[PDB]
């Protein structure tokens, strides 16, 4: 998304930077990851961690 700043004023010399409008439609916020990488890397953790268990 792509929001907007609005500057409320709440006293002499104090501006409160509140949100204005959301420009567009509300899609979610996400962080992907690789998948062949995360499967390999999680497979190197188990090989090392078996040495203690």
């Amino acid at each position: 998304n792509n929001n907007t700043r609005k500057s409320i004023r709440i006293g002499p010399g104090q501006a409160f930077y509140a949100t204005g409008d959301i420009i567009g439609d509300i899609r979610q916020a996400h962080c992907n990851v690789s998948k062949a990488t995360w499967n390999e890397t999680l497979g190197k953790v188990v090989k090392q961690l078996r040495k203690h268990f």
Binding site: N2, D21, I22, I23, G24, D25, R27
Partner: protein
């Protein structure tokens, strides 16, 4: 589920700006799509103007006629709000308002934005008499 109802002045006189607003119903005015206009003078084709991109301050126009227009988008009421400046009697037509293709991420279709929902169409004739 858009159903665009429009209503203009009804009969404008020459060298006086006219305005039309397309009341959107059944759908919000925030969907990443272009909200644009078009005209169909009797005879020549469906001459187009430009849009507003649901509620930003970003626009494109029709340089094929010129950059007279200054269309806005006032939401929270679902208004659509065309404004035509310095009209002459040659501008008479029937006016249609139309939205875009409802992209997913702000500009997915590079340059397509085909006009897919034509609401009802309204006509105004401009003359000194």
């Amino acid at each position: 589920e858009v159903q665009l109802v429009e209503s203009g002045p009804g009969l404008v006189k020459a060298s006086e700006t006219l305005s039309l607003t397309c009341t959107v119903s059944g759908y919000n005015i925030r969907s990443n799509n272009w909200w644009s206009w078009v005209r169909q003078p009797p005879g020549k084709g469906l001459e187009w103007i430009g849009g507003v991109y649901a509620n930003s301050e970003i626009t494109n126009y029709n340089s094929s006629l010129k950059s007279r227009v200054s269309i806005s988008q006032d939401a929270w009421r679902n208004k659509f709000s065309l404004k035509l400046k310095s009209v002459t009697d040659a501008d008479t037509a029937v006016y249609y308002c139309v939205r875009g293709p409802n992209h997913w991420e702000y500009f997915d279709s590079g340059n397509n934005e085909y006009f897919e929902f034509w609401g009802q169409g309204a006509l105004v004739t401009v003359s000194s008499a």
